[PDB]
């Protein structure tokens, strides 16, 4: 869910996930034929925000086919605990949310590379298994 | 509607009379407790070797 | 805790291979094994560990980390208990006690006032069911990081059932003080015949 | 948050917290089964949801649905998620008897070919439109207050709130379908 | 001697006004507080969401393009949507497993962009003034009723609420003209 | 771990791993010969809960041999925090356990399944 | 990163990643020609921790040409919360850092293990078919 | 094995008697009455759609 | 987080809802109990038999 | 009759907190605030290029 | 409506019992005060050198 792709050509696009800061959103142009020509865009000169869930493009989309938007959370801590201070709910909430988010991107990333090897190995294993053992048992 | 009632203090001890005749500040059992004079029920002090 | 005794861990600090330190608590109790039971180990800040059932054949324990050159406290815990009586409509004017013994009564809620308390539990048993409620010191938004929670306030919970089967109990076996002041209840009443 | 929708919200916990507010006490903070109130509230919420969903609206009724019989012994099962079984434009005689589909006109329980009927199925609470959720929450709060703790001022306001929400639900219903009457008429 | 406030925010003032009904003084921040501050925000948010969903002249967007992704043809159902309808016909749309469901075809396999009519949600501090006042009064009534049943703080909020409701009505009637005698002409 | 396989032709089954909610359990029937015949059951219509550890099957195992149960943790909050409430240890424990479980599953499951298939082959 | 490769025949080696305990780091030898030949060592009789960032061996062979060092975080609550105790910043910090570390750990070793198991299964299929 | 609305109606009717004959409360009442009325009208509405009941049947000639 | 019930049975649920009118908690079994559980069943059975006898479209067999 | 003009760098018009009502004299209007800028629902944009004329009501001191 | 109450005289001293049990004449702290019998609270007289 953290990775989304749309066809190129329009001027307005939507964001379909939650985020903690506006620096955790990345926009990239994609060329399917030659993946060595991708380019990254920067806020303030290529695109601008309108409302918390929708952006607008300001550049030329030529020679590209897909626009990709995904989330990338940072690793540094947000809340610092110190002895001799009052405990509040907001700190706990932010601390929990950061870890939950990071785990989300980790799983979503790893499953993609996992599945194809997994099911290829499984299918080959099963096909070999039955095609050999029943054939040999009928032969004997 | 609703009715309510409160108990001001717990200073009485246990009792063994039938429940209809007891007072309002007598309980049923009490183990390892201290009935002070101005702080209510407490826990008994520790022991040193 | 019970049978408190202070102690200072000697210079010898663990072993490099596993950095686990030994204590040999036998020295603290006058070079003698203590009586069988359960024992705790509270440090100088408040965090405590739970040792096993110490018998008379062994007096050596192992701790997780360096420790060494520190002050500790050892003892045993005991239990506190108190059981309430039945809740009835009581009227009393220093001349005598009168208890209403007519009709049916259904209970709804209850509350307890406390002062300088660390932890407590309340148990309700109606027919075959048990409900456990717990509260701990202050509430969120007033505590301070670094110390233990000891404060005041008020607690409200739910009591449902008939008034001739329900019971309430208090328990505590934590190393914190306890103090209770007052209590009360609310109910709904219904009769079928005027008195007098 | 303070400015916009809070992140990663849980609907059932919010509904329970709203239900407990009518009594006059703060949140529960975990939604555990140990507490007495949660178990009492959940059953009432489930019953109210099931009752309200069964009236039949424009986004529930599936006119054309196909049921298929079994192979070894010709029968059709009666799942507990069914709420209404009818026929499109004619009289129908359908009922449950022994966990299978019964036809009163024929007096038998042996279907041989797939049939087409009209039915309404159940959906989880979190996927209903907003106004329905608010209506259900207010209704359920009414029973919860009435049966377990009688307060005289929480009432006399929930009634007005319920009527106001009912009117809005009706207006929302009338907008999905245009319902033209002058159609299917034409001549010189 | 005009009154210029110090450090004004369009949310803290609403919270303070909602506390004024009970009869407590104001606060200076929303980070540390007792239960009341944590009890007012829930009601305020619920009332805002309920009121905004009725549908007005500045919310309704007749033209809007929803587009599918590229990998698995589907359309997501964000939690900020409030109403989904077709402009001049009947519609069968609903949410099933966080996706758009069409009852007519009984599938979730849209392949081309669709044009629909929906209503989205806006933050509290970007609405016209009368709406904000109406919302605050509505929230205050419930807050007073549910926690502290005073008999004199009421009997007045109702009177204010009726007047505010009226004003909202004639505010709505002025943005649009709605001339019935349109698209009519011949000799 | 987070995945388990059992022989077919039974009435009851047991769950050994841990979960935070009762909607995080997934059941699936497995055909050894052809992976494409795999089908996913659904609660209420096919199975029901007796106790917090065992389920009951209400469908017939006709052409299948292996029953597979795995865990998939959700992404919604289990514990929220608000000022004025009562704080205990279990809240913090669950708040940590959710984020631990997600990562553990996402790291282990696929490798475990590949190991199972290879050692079965 | 999380996986490190060093040549053998050296007296001193260093670790370049953080950790939460001394039982998480894993030390093993590796023989390139024989993938099966690697052997995993263990504490005490083979290596010792002189400095938190220093590792010293005890015995070294010659058939093994290179070494491998990588992290292995457990799935058990390091911190324990109990009623009637104190709360410290270190507990809250470590409880958060655990899952974070697990994330980038898995993100590295998962893909490498998957291919090895897959082509092992493929080789099993192959020799099962041919003989 | 009866339809749902009938079961709800029966449960409400039984609850009314159970409250009336063993524990007389003035607030648990005054609510079951309106709930029963609503369930009653719902039951009638449900019953009316099972049959079509067209009065213009069996009539035809030039 | 839908409410998945444990060991659901219709009769036990009906008795539990009928008990909730007074304000008592639920039960787990019906084999043994106090007088109230033995007083609700009679009323439930009588009301069921009375209601089913009015005659509806799915009962009458010509 | 009132005149509003956009700035130079970009093409936007600000929404001051002293505005109470914004409408068009003799027709239907679609104006609102989104992120402290003027929004036109008819065209779905916040990019005006020429000065426009509307009617509005502002605030005055109490005295 | 509105309710009210009044206190006639302040002659009691401080008290350390829980607030539910105190009288209406007992406060919480009292430093440098003189509780006369006909003029209420006052300030203690000065000292000469």
mmCIF file of N, CA and C in Angstrom, chain B:
data_model
loop_
_atom_site.group_PDB
_atom_site.id
_atom_site.type_symbol
_atom_site.label_atom_id
_atom_site.label_comp_id
_atom_site.label_asym_id
_atom_site.label_seq_id
_atom_site.Cartn_x
_atom_site.Cartn_y
_atom_site.Cartn_z
ATOM 1 N N UNK B 1 -36.153 5.802 40.697
ATOM 2 C CA UNK B 1 -34.868 6.501 40.628
ATOM 3 C C UNK B 1 -33.753 5.743 41.335
ATOM 4 N N UNK B 2 -32.734 6.465 41.783
ATOM 5 C CA UNK B 2 -31.577 5.870 42.428
ATOM 6 C C UNK B 2 -31.445 6.375 43.858
ATOM 7 N N UNK B 3 -30.898 5.522 44.721
ATOM 8 C CA UNK B 3 -30.608 5.874 46.103
ATOM 9 C C UNK B 3 -29.140 5.570 46.370
ATOM 10 N N UNK B 4 -28.600 6.206 47.407
ATOM 11 C CA UNK B 4 -27.180 6.084 47.696
ATOM 12 C C UNK B 4 -26.941 6.215 49.191
ATOM 13 N N UNK B 5 -25.752 5.791 49.613
ATOM 14 C CA UNK B 5 -25.353 5.844 51.011
ATOM 15 C C UNK B 5 -23.837 5.727 51.080
ATOM 16 N N UNK B 6 -23.259 6.268 52.148
ATOM 17 C CA UNK B 6 -21.814 6.311 52.306
ATOM 18 C C UNK B 6 -21.428 5.898 53.719
ATOM 19 N N UNK B 7 -20.166 5.499 53.870
ATOM 20 C CA UNK B 7 -19.606 5.086 55.152
ATOM 21 C C UNK B 7 -18.481 6.049 55.501
ATOM 22 N N UNK B 8 -18.581 6.676 56.673
ATOM 23 C CA UNK B 8 -17.650 7.744 57.026
ATOM 24 C C UNK B 8 -16.266 7.198 57.357
ATOM 25 N N UNK B 9 -16.198 6.134 58.154
ATOM 26 C CA UNK B 9 -14.914 5.641 58.630
ATOM 27 C C UNK B 9 -14.986 4.141 58.874
ATOM 28 N N UNK B 10 -13.833 3.482 58.783
ATOM 29 C CA UNK B 10 -13.714 2.042 59.020
ATOM 30 C C UNK B 10 -12.793 1.841 60.218
ATOM 31 N N UNK B 11 -13.376 1.831 61.414
ATOM 32 C CA UNK B 11 -12.609 1.680 62.645
ATOM 33 C C UNK B 11 -12.979 0.431 63.426
ATOM 34 N N UNK B 12 -14.167 -0.122 63.201
ATOM 35 C CA UNK B 12 -14.537 -1.352 63.871
ATOM 36 C C UNK B 12 -13.776 -2.546 63.330
ATOM 37 N N UNK B 13 -13.786 -3.621 64.109
ATOM 38 C CA UNK B 13 -13.114 -4.836 63.701
ATOM 39 C C UNK B 13 -14.045 -5.818 63.026
ATOM 40 N N UNK B 14 -13.767 -7.110 63.178
ATOM 41 C CA UNK B 14 -14.620 -8.152 62.622
ATOM 42 C C UNK B 14 -15.785 -8.403 63.566
ATOM 43 N N UNK B 15 -16.783 -9.149 63.099
ATOM 44 C CA UNK B 15 -17.920 -9.525 63.925
ATOM 45 C C UNK B 15 -18.454 -10.864 63.446
ATOM 46 N N UNK B 16 -19.178 -11.553 64.330
ATOM 47 C CA UNK B 16 -19.717 -12.870 64.014
ATOM 48 C C UNK B 16 -21.215 -12.973 64.272
ATOM 49 N N UNK B 17 -21.891 -11.858 64.510
ATOM 50 C CA UNK B 17 -23.336 -11.845 64.673
ATOM 51 C C UNK B 17 -24.011 -11.939 63.312
ATOM 52 N N UNK B 18 -25.292 -12.309 63.274
ATOM 53 C CA UNK B 18 -26.013 -12.326 61.997
ATOM 54 C C UNK B 18 -26.039 -10.945 61.360
ATOM 55 N N UNK B 19 -26.031 -10.930 60.024
ATOM 56 C CA UNK B 19 -25.782 -9.706 59.271
ATOM 57 C C UNK B 19 -26.833 -8.630 59.503
ATOM 58 N N UNK B 20 -28.047 -9.003 59.915
ATOM 59 C CA UNK B 20 -29.102 -8.017 60.142
ATOM 60 C C UNK B 20 -28.812 -7.117 61.332
ATOM 61 N N UNK B 21 -27.999 -7.570 62.286
ATOM 62 C CA UNK B 21 -27.793 -6.852 63.534
ATOM 63 C C UNK B 21 -26.471 -6.100 63.622
ATOM 64 N N UNK B 22 -25.609 -6.188 62.614
ATOM 65 C CA UNK B 22 -24.303 -5.553 62.699
ATOM 66 C C UNK B 22 -24.417 -4.036 62.582
ATOM 67 N N UNK B 23 -23.312 -3.362 62.877
ATOM 68 C CA UNK B 23 -23.213 -1.919 62.717
ATOM 69 C C UNK B 23 -22.776 -1.608 61.285
ATOM 70 N N UNK B 24 -22.506 -0.338 60.990
ATOM 71 C CA UNK B 24 -22.153 0.084 59.644
ATOM 72 C C UNK B 24 -20.656 0.068 59.372
ATOM 73 N N UNK B 25 -19.823 -0.166 60.386
ATOM 74 C CA UNK B 25 -18.374 -0.121 60.219
ATOM 75 C C UNK B 25 -17.687 -1.386 60.724
ATOM 76 N N UNK B 26 -18.380 -2.518 60.711
ATOM 77 C CA UNK B 26 -17.808 -3.794 61.110
ATOM 78 C C UNK B 26 -17.777 -4.736 59.915
ATOM 79 N N UNK B 27 -16.614 -5.331 59.667
ATOM 80 C CA UNK B 27 -16.431 -6.166 58.497
ATOM 81 C C UNK B 27 -16.618 -7.645 58.754
ATOM 82 N N UNK B 28 -15.938 -8.474 57.964
ATOM 83 C CA UNK B 28 -16.039 -9.921 58.081
ATOM 84 C C UNK B 28 -14.726 -10.603 58.432
ATOM 85 N N UNK B 29 -13.597 -10.152 57.893
ATOM 86 C CA UNK B 29 -12.292 -10.663 58.284
ATOM 87 C C UNK B 29 -11.272 -9.557 58.083
ATOM 88 N N UNK B 30 -10.146 -9.671 58.783
ATOM 89 C CA UNK B 30 -9.117 -8.637 58.731
ATOM 90 C C UNK B 30 -7.787 -9.275 59.103
ATOM 91 N N UNK B 31 -6.869 -9.353 58.144
ATOM 92 C CA UNK B 31 -5.570 -9.983 58.337
ATOM 93 C C UNK B 31 -4.479 -8.990 57.971
ATOM 94 N N UNK B 32 -3.499 -8.843 58.859
ATOM 95 C CA UNK B 32 -2.346 -7.969 58.652
ATOM 96 C C UNK B 32 -2.782 -6.543 58.316
ATOM 97 N N UNK B 33 -3.524 -5.945 59.242
ATOM 98 C CA UNK B 33 -3.995 -4.579 59.083
ATOM 99 C C UNK B 33 -3.858 -3.846 60.408
ATOM 100 N N UNK B 34 -3.752 -2.524 60.322
ATOM 101 C CA UNK B 34 -3.602 -1.671 61.491
ATOM 102 C C UNK B 34 -4.650 -0.572 61.429
ATOM 103 N N UNK B 35 -5.446 -0.450 62.486
ATOM 104 C CA UNK B 35 -6.539 0.519 62.542
ATOM 105 C C UNK B 35 -6.044 1.745 63.298
ATOM 106 N N UNK B 36 -5.447 2.682 62.568
ATOM 107 C CA UNK B 36 -4.913 3.886 63.183
ATOM 108 C C UNK B 36 -6.054 4.788 63.647
ATOM 109 N N UNK B 37 -5.686 5.939 64.202
ATOM 110 C CA UNK B 37 -6.649 6.861 64.787
ATOM 111 C C UNK B 37 -6.956 8.055 63.898
ATOM 112 N N UNK B 38 -6.109 8.346 62.903
ATOM 113 C CA UNK B 38 -6.384 9.485 62.033
ATOM 114 C C UNK B 38 -6.059 9.216 60.566
ATOM 115 N N UNK B 39 -5.658 7.998 60.202
ATOM 116 C CA UNK B 39 -5.312 7.712 58.813
ATOM 117 C C UNK B 39 -6.080 6.546 58.210
ATOM 118 N N UNK B 40 -7.034 5.946 58.912
ATOM 119 C CA UNK B 40 -7.734 4.810 58.348
ATOM 120 C C UNK B 40 -6.870 3.559 58.321
ATOM 121 N N UNK B 41 -7.330 2.582 57.542
ATOM 122 C CA UNK B 41 -6.634 1.304 57.453
ATOM 123 C C UNK B 41 -5.262 1.471 56.816
ATOM 124 N N UNK B 42 -4.304 0.675 57.286
ATOM 125 C CA UNK B 42 -2.939 0.692 56.785
ATOM 126 C C UNK B 42 -2.417 -0.736 56.731
ATOM 127 N N UNK B 43 -1.155 -0.876 56.348
ATOM 128 C CA UNK B 43 -0.466 -2.152 56.414
ATOM 129 C C UNK B 43 0.518 -2.146 57.576
ATOM 130 N N UNK B 44 0.637 -3.289 58.246
ATOM 131 C CA UNK B 44 1.466 -3.359 59.437
ATOM 132 C C UNK B 44 2.939 -3.150 59.082
ATOM 133 N N UNK B 45 3.716 -2.568 59.992
ATOM 134 C CA UNK B 45 5.112 -2.231 59.687
ATOM 135 C C UNK B 45 5.955 -3.475 59.478
ATOM 136 N N UNK B 46 7.092 -3.350 58.805
ATOM 137 C CA UNK B 46 7.945 -4.507 58.526
ATOM 138 C C UNK B 46 8.722 -4.943 59.764
ATOM 139 N N UNK B 47 9.617 -5.908 59.558
ATOM 140 C CA UNK B 47 10.383 -6.529 60.632
ATOM 141 C C UNK B 47 11.852 -6.576 60.241
ATOM 142 N N UNK B 48 12.736 -6.286 61.196
ATOM 143 C CA UNK B 48 14.170 -6.172 60.941
ATOM 144 C C UNK B 48 14.907 -7.301 61.652
ATOM 145 N N UNK B 49 15.903 -7.869 60.976
ATOM 146 C CA UNK B 49 16.676 -8.984 61.503
ATOM 147 C C UNK B 49 17.800 -8.498 62.409
#
